[model samples]
Target chain A: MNDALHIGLPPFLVQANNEPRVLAAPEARMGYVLELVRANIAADGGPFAAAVFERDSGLLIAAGTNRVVPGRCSAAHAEILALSLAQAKLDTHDLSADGLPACELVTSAEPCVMCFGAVIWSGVRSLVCAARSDDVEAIGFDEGPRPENWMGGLEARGITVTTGLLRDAACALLREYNACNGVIYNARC
Target chain B: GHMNDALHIGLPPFLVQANNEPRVLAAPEARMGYVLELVRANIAADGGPFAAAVFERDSGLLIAAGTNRVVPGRCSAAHAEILALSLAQAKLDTHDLSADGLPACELVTSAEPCVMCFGAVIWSGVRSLVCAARSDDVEAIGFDEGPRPENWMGGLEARGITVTTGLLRDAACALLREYNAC
Candidate 1:
């Protein structure tokens, strides 16, 4: 989505861009959600994608920009910077403003597994975009062996790991349910 | 109607700056007195757009209707909701988290829209771009036409949609019924 054409937005929304104007309706709401995400979500290095959700709309809440560097970033550098920047950014915002606004960001590369908890501890829920198993060899950069490590680090940071619009956790959950739900667990929890 | 209520997501503002051109539509660039005006409308149609907006020489937000003072576009119901949703998300995101928060996602729209706003939407990020949706206006020119909210939902969901509103207002205000591109 570029800028010149943004003018044609529907009347359903009360558009607030260069100036504040009332929109028609539902479209305004949808546009609001997308704009919310674009404004907030950013990675420690550079943000790849972000999204926003509202209680009133369905799947319409997800929207953001993508300028990710599409390769094995200096994992060590990203890992280190991700912890500090994410922490700093998260610290700047808090949960007290539930009625206000919130944002989330993700990177295509595997995140620092150890720092996930640190990020969550900052009070922002995060999704560690799972890296592809096949892509690891092609890139020739040292991603990690345990994808769960990424989740594990975020867990340590006190963040609940889940699948967002990125569709990683959702696909995993679907696969896990399809594969494991049927594995006759003779043992009781 | 008792329809199923679903997830309430918020969208960010698509900020830009423009001036009145030969056609009287907002053109890109800033602070030339050639500048016609500034506005902040909502994209999503739910949460905060209903709030009347506030503005000044440089910055302003579309505050809640009852909060400080009441100001807004006051369009049709659906359009207002969409604009409110987008404004809520954009304003909330600009602030830190310790305050009230909303959803997170990115959306790219289908049609090119006219928001009559540009300078304010830029508050959230940098760089603005847009592409035309349809070459033909099979429907009426404004919301008064088909008046479908679904079109907007897709328009502002993933990526902030563009706008083409108030051209008539511009022409009427400018002294001609023409919209010359800036």
Candidate 2:
């Protein structure tokens, strides 16, 4: 009966349940994550930024892809909007990195400390995720006064956070991005 | 509602009993547009290039009384209802479910693609899945054959997205969301 209200899923799932869902559309979304990497990339263009994303499976992990950073480190964590739970996982995953690749901030969810710590420990710069809302809340964290105060922890630890909001049409497009693409992508322009 | 201009990608055919039950357990068409919208939005705000799917729905609908008209309903009435109201708005179903502007059938569900969508996309039928998950910013994309990510929200009260084993990964990874079918 209670869950986060997602446009694609039940409204209750994302709303009442406090689950993460769409806050906007897509066009505006791509740039935010890109900015994170841009801001973090070292002069030599190694690896310093990373992102988090939500998989259909409902788990958060270290994200990996061709997106290169500009510094030096290891580890890449991602998920949707980087919520508190995801942050924790990101932190855990970051410890696994050794530094051939700077850290990567990949997540479609919101931002949080566990994730921030992961980025920091792995020596990642920049980040990726959705926009900022006065709606910064965490879940399963009755451990403190505010159950979802993950963002606060990140700020306290001294990490710069950036985000973007999507438009209605863009969000719809994001859903079909992969759908529109058929099979293999050619490297040619 | 009706699945016009909608695309039905992958199906595992597990509980999908075509002989007795409707073709789709999901009024997925009605939700496709909306879910796509949200996915895009979530990505825009975060830039992590994410992918999501719908399934595992306790949601169900059947032929109406004496009418071929399928309606939106759940075997479990009160304690459980995934996205019924949204279904209604999609014109995908109705409590009474008049045939006007409605699809010949109706279905509501409780299960989803789970976080495995990353994996799901990487499969044969779903190979385009990874490429489809591209963006103006994403750099790399792939499927996880291992365990599901943990930060994904999990519980039994069950969110409407149902059975979703979502994944959280780094951003700017090359997801190659553009391709050709050949």
Candidate 3:
């Protein structure tokens, strides 16, 4: 029996320095995340990625890619990694807690049912997505029982939502991964 | 900026000790009874009244056990189901518990999974899910159970995952009510 469970980014994703890079625009942030997805695909990893940033300052807090297969943990989705990493970095489970900057989650694709529920509890003030869930499902990934009005659910909880930041590019990455025959770990058995 | 490369979710010390012994709980009520004890202990430990474990569906050998570590571990996603499932996967060194060459596994929890964990269950590759309390019992204590599908059991069944609920329910609900009373 293990005392703890560990989930993390691949070593190549670790930055060489502690430089603060601010991305003030959604396109810029989405562009950066697209590159992360590309790198992950090249690493033979799941073709998904996400990053957390300060809502106003746009300071990149943490970045994560899907580690479901490599990390050997079903809950190790890109969004879960990014959100949990940010929480670990900030030393608080609630990102909206006092003394913390408003946090935003920028992802290469819209969150699935699991990530959608995770986003609500993450205390992120805003969410930005590049590709839609349909685009993801097009590549044979199971999005899982997501509610029709997922955006409304998040909004009701005080978390703003944005989608299709870079739809074409994000969808292209999905297509590329599918074409390469990447493992769809959650394909219905 | 040196970002954290890893996030660690640890079980409480007592659970670590309890998990050391190989225990088999063949019946659903027996498993739920074991999980209920963890829930009661978790409440006393200042965590939420929730606990879950993974066991071999046939042999009932305990694989891993977890209680809520959201507050102490500083992770909103550290629900008992998530931790137990993840720990089981880590112990087996595979993402899917139903992966080839492994015995069928089941996730036994004190309460029904929230929406997040419900989705997680589909991905976890567990053959069955056993629960004690209902979602309403969790929500009645002011915890957000999230918006699960209306027919969550059917949802899992469609995915080939078995669902069982209401085992040792009164005992589990009593733990939640006890937590609230404190």
Candidate 4:
């Protein structure tokens, strides 16, 4: 019985940025999320990233971005990446957004339908959004099913939403990416 | 069809703008005169490329006007809508400018907002939008407007931002051509 689901030590330990682990305000935290997205774009990554942060102290928990074009699953969204990593760090699988988790999830764009469900189930408490669905949709990618009142639905599920902070900066980034002539792979409707 | 029924999300009733009133739809040419003067002053000030103004919809009082100032700190994000809204917000001394008690404002742009400007207009609480020219007109002169809205979900009306277009549209194109000529 030596082969009883042999799992190796955690593959890699994620590290938060060394300096200024705690942001002074929500806007600061949002700025950090934009920095991550810009870094992702600079590295030839996707135009999205999400970071989990402590709501009260604004302490950085874990940040993650997508490499779905290489990973073979467009579903490897930034919110999903950050959620899974935060869950592992807390060592408690339940990250449900129903006021159980103490962290907030910040993303570069509005969560698509699939990512929206992931955030709800992942147990993060709140969300801060930089860009709207149309911003993403403008870049030649359909954002799936983002019913306009999606924010209200999240709040009903006990997940708070703050839409449209630093939006122009994010929009500018999207336009720059569009002008880059990078291949855009928009999957099925 | 049952498919159409699934789209309803019980959205909040659209909030009426505080000081906004129904606009005169009959006088498109007359309205363009006000915007045309702004455009000309912008051109004279060398504020060209494009310009815009925000006006009190009910009173038609000019709140602020801005021209594309992509010189140093200002970039494409500093287009008229962003510039005007930032000024309005600073003047109001609040982040949410559309809160109750603030006068309703409408944006008048020399050309239709590109994707960036559209996001700015939505987030900054502008009640309505009036455009002199289409993105197609600007794109005709080499600037790509980037994936203009095609669906109901992404369109301005879907977001509850009333839009009026094609007033002084040719004048807008003429200005663009003159700028390109320069």
Tens digit of per-residue lDDT, candidate 2, span A94-148: 3223532333344333433323333333333435444332222321211111124
Report the lDDT tens digits of candidate 3 across residue range A1-189: 356777756665666113467999999889988988988877767999999999999899888888899889999888998898888888888999999999999999999889988998899999999998888988788889977688998888889999999999999888888777635564521
Q: What TM-score would chain B of candidate 4 score versus the native chain B?
A: 0.75
Cα lDDT of candidate 2 equals 0.26
lDDT of 1 by residue, A71-180 (tens): 11111122222222222222322321355233332333333222232233223444434334333233342322223354554566545455333334323322322343
User: Can you give the DockQ of every candidate in the order shown?
Assistant: 0.02, 0.02, 0.61, 0.01
Better of 1 and 3 by TM-score: 3
lDDT of 3: 0.86
Instruction: Give the C-alpha miss distance for residue A78 in model 4, angstroms.
Output: 17
- Of candidates 4 and 1, the better by DockQ: 1
lDDT (10s digit) by residue, model 3, range B1-182:
11445767766777786566689888778888888888878877778889999999988888988888888888999999998899899889999998999899999999999999998889999999999998888888989978776787899999999998888889998888888998
Tens-digit lDDT track for model 4 on A1-189? 011101111112133332337885878887888887767666555788788888777888667675444332233457756765565555444554244438799888887654665565556779999988888898985565334566786798788999788899888877876776446654420
Q: Tens-digit lDDT track for model 1 on B1-182? A: 00011111122232221111122212222211111221212222222211111111123212211110011211111122123223333334332112233332111112222221121122222122222222123122321112122344243333342333322233223311112111
Full-model lDDT, candidate 4 = 0.60
**Per-residue lDDT of B1-182 in model 2, one digit per residue for the tens?**
21111101111121122112342334444333333333344343332223232222324233210100101110000101112222222223222222255433222221222222222111101101111222222322332211223333232112112222111212212222421110
Best by TM-score: 3
Tell how far residue A126 is off in model 3, in angstroms. Answer: 0.9
* lDDT of model 1, residue B78: 16
Evaluated on chain A only, model 1 obtains a TM-score of 0.33
Over 4 Å off, model 2? A1-102, A111-123, A131-149, A165-170, A173-189, B1-182
Off by over 4 Å in 3: A16-19, A182-189, B1-3
Q: Estimated TM-score per prediction?
A: 0.23, 0.22, 0.94, 0.45
Which runs in model 1 stand beyond 4 Å of their true positions?
A: A1-48, A51-91, A95-109, A113-118, A126-130, A133-137, A141-148, A156-158, A163-189, B1-182
**Global lDDT for candidate 1?**
0.26
